[PDB]
Design a protein around this nucleic acid. Structure first.
Ligand SMILES: [Ca+2]
Ligand SMILES: [Ca+2]
Ligand SMILES: [Ca+2]
Ligand SMILES: [Ca+2]
Ligand SMILES: [Ca+2]
Ligand SMILES: [Ca+2]
Ligand SMILES: [Ca+2]
Ligand SMILES: [Ca+2]
Ligand SMILES: [Ca+2]
Ligand SMILES: [Ca+2]
Ligand SMILES: [Ca+2]
Ligand SMILES: [Ca+2]
Ligand SMILES: [Ca+2]
Ligand SMILES: [Ca+2]
Ligand SMILES: [Ca+2]
Ligand SMILES: [Ca+2]
Ligand SMILES: [Ca+2]
Ligand SMILES: [Ca+2]
Ligand SMILES: [Cl-]
Ligand SMILES: [Cl-]
Ligand SMILES: [K+]
Ligand SMILES: [K+]
Ligand SMILES: [K+]
Lengths: 82, 100, 63, 55, 103, 83, 54, 63
DNA sequence: GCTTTTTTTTTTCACAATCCCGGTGCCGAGGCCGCTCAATTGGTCGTAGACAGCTCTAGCACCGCTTAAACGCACGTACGGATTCCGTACGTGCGTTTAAGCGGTGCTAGAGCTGTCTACGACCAATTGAGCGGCCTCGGCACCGGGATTGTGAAAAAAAAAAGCTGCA
DNA sequence: GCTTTTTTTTTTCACAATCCCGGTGCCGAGGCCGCTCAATTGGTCGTAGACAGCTCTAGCACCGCTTAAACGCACGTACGGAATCCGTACGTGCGTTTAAGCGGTGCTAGAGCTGTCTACGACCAATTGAGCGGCCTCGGCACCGGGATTGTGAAAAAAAAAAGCTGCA
């Protein structure tokens, strides 16, 4: 079961996120659409993170690899060694 | 004859107020962690992750989706709906310059 | 800590560019000040300029 | 890609429009210059389907 | 009606023609002098007795028209998203809000 | 030394032309005034930064490069006037 | 501002949420950090009018 | 000319960071390459890396 | 107008969510202590840039003519938006199932630090050719006028799908 | 099937707008020239970082309990969206008015370059105290239970606007 861990992003988790963004009523077609978007997000961020890892010659991805990736993507993050 | 039932939308609003009030992560940690490691596979094999790298990624993802939902919502309301649909998300991401 | 580093990098980066554009080898308190006007919103910039000006003046008097 | 856009418009010399058509019609160049404005470039011919005459 | 003989084009036909015309061309669509006065006028609010390179005014106009032409693209989508063909101030306002130009 | 509300020189036809290039087919009357406000804000923001670069360089003349540096700052990079 | 948000929650110590409340409720700080994510901050309570019961 | 100067600044700047993040005083061909991978889209990066590698190889052999 | 019904209205009751008491226990904020370093001090030396002085680029103002564009109104169509209405996609709540989260243990990859040594890059002085500005030319390309071509819109003429009618199986 | 109609076709004609050509003329792309300054050559000197070698951090795997969260299913309400319908806001086209655009001239603020000279910042060695890691402590804060209270909405019961109907004249 699950070569697609993307399904482990449950309908409920997606509803919760949507709640915190003030969404009240949610089309059935959203949960699969959201997974589509979340993947592209992580694809782009992890790609750059892993490039920072390879360049440092490491086999371990660090919080700083992610922080540097997110900043490059215009999604600056505070609290993980900025 | 039947004790209490809430009308569609009432619990929704109840959840909105609860989650807008809290800061804890709203995706379960292990499922998220596997997805991260699964996606990492495609770029380089036998990769290790600091736990704080995975926690950084989840914070950034959750923040991104909450924010996209805020924009998706407004698009729904703009077309005089209360129900967010894919085309709402699509329009938000089009105007945000994330998508062709 | 993130916040300080973030704004450090922004001001220092703009300052770097100010000097570069004007063919200057030196970042002075004047490049920092311009950087700040460009980077901070209205009120914040006024107070920030005010505090920076006050700190330099005090320092130069106390040298 | 600009040279080709000039050739299509029966012109010898590349102008900003040829660069714009070149860049905006290429998925990848378009992404690389997604936040760049090309002076005197204009926009790609694009009329949303809903706006055309129905029949 | 009938042989009025202007051959009055239906509402939206000339509109479409103008769209094809202006999407074909790259020439600036605001009149140069009016725009140059407006630039000088807005610049007075920041500093008095300012001079402008002619290329500095042309760079501001290229920048402006590109920004408005692009905001109209996004505005048009917001109008269509609400099953209208007519752009309205709330369209522009939604575009600018989603763009993060406005709170 | 004239001001005299030159924003009205941004005519209805000129705004209609810009909307046409943007693919817009039908326009509410309310747009024209709403656009003029938007255009003003845009120029205020770009020109405020251009002029900052001017004052820092100790000049009395705004250069293309002041604008090009101003636009780049405002995430609106412009090609074909230097830099 | 964060120390004020902390006292209003009857808390001695600032946590990321007090920093988030401080920043997002200040028009200028919000602008300065308009493209920054504060880890463990959540969002300002806000519900669109059309969604409310009346 | 604007295009060349743009991508010069982007690549160089990313390289500046890569060397800074890894406590390196020196920008090498490895920093440029990693910058290119981060900055250019899929197919463009591949060609670019290919043409960059070729040119270094051919330069080093030509001394 | 009558009876009959749906729609909206209020009234009355149920149920979370919060706030005020009571308390406990865990773990990380906080602060102290050696003591690693980087900040300070006082010195020299070199050059960045402040300033004055001069050149001359290009930015500003002005005028008057032509004509393209802006303006304002007349007119009507197609658009926006309100109202109505129907089907079911979603929200709610329940019982059942699943695996996340926790706290612990056991193993070791690989992060990360030190010490050594030399390949490589900064710096310099001398050399010189690539690329600069300045200048001249001549062919692309902007603009024009004329004719060919393409698309639009109105009415009329045909083709089709729809409506009320009517008998026989 | 039959007429007998509306709805959708198609066809035919006038007309405006756009497209495509060759002709013409202007000016900037293009290339040549001569001088210059930045790239190259060959030289020294120092240290950045490649590498080996060792430490021990923290990342991974695994295990076994306890739920909280996920799952799926029934059920129905309120929402999305189709259809209808009406008023006028907006597009089109025309005549009238305006001022941009053009090409040209005249004047000089000030952009930008040069030469001079010294105040200021880089660099360095000696000194030493701020701030680092490590370590211990003790109170904040997460969590808990027991009530009272006030938000947040859901029925239920009546009131009202709406919709049926009908027999009259
Ligand atoms: Ca403030
Ligand atoms: Ca207590
Ligand atoms: Ca604990
Ligand atoms: Ca304490
Ligand atoms: Ca000691
Ligand atoms: Ca020591
Ligand atoms: Ca000193
Ligand atoms: Ca003329
Ligand atoms: Ca190793
Ligand atoms: Ca070392
Ligand atoms: Ca030559
Ligand atoms: Ca040349
Ligand atoms: Ca030629
Ligand atoms: Ca050498
Ligand atoms: Ca001067
Ligand atoms: Ca101390
Ligand atoms: Ca400490
Ligand atoms: Ca409780
Ligand atoms: Cl959709
Ligand atoms: Cl509006
Ligand atoms: K000048
Ligand atoms: K480790
Ligand atoms: K000086």
């Amino acid at each position: 079961v699950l070569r697609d861990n993307i399904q482990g992003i449950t309908k409920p988790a997606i509803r919760r996120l949507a709640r915190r963004g003030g969404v009240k009523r949610i089309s059935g077609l959203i949960y699969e659409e959201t997974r589509g978007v979340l993947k592209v997000f992580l694809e782009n961020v992890i790609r750059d993170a892993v490039t920072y890892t390879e360049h440092a010659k490491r086999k371990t991805v660090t919080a700083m690899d992610v922080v540097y990736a997110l900043k490059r993507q215009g999604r600056t993050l505070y609290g993980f060694g900025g | 004859k039947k004790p209490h039932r809430y009308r569609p939308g009432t619990v929704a609003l109840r959840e909105i107020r609860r989650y807008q009030k809290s800061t804890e992560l709203l995706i379960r940690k292990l499922p998220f962690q596997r997805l991260v490691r699964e996606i990492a596979q495609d770029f380089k094999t036998d990769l290790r992750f600091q736990s704080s790298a995975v926690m950084a990624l989840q914070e950034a993802c959750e923040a991104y989706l909450v924010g996209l939902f805020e924009d998706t919502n407004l698009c729904a309301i703009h077309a005089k709906r209360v129900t967010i649909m894919p085309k709402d998300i699509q329009l938000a991401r089009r105007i945000r310059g994330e998508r062709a | 800590n993130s916040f300080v580093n973030d704004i450090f990098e922004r001001i220092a980066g703009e300052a770097s560019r100010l000097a570069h554009y004007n063919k200057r080898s030196t970042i002075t308190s004047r490049e920092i000040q311009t950087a700040v006007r460009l980077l901070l919103p209205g009120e914040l910039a006024k107070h920030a300029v005010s505090e920076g000006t006050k700190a330099v003046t005090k320092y130069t008097s106390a040298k | 890609l600009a040279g080709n856009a000039a050739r299509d418009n029966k012109k010898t010399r590349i102008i900003p429009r040829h660069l714009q058509l070149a860049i905006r019609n290429d998925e990848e160049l378009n992404k690389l210059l997604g936040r760049v404005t090309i002076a005197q470039g204009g926009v790609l011919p694009n009329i949303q389907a809903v706006l055309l005459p129905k029949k």
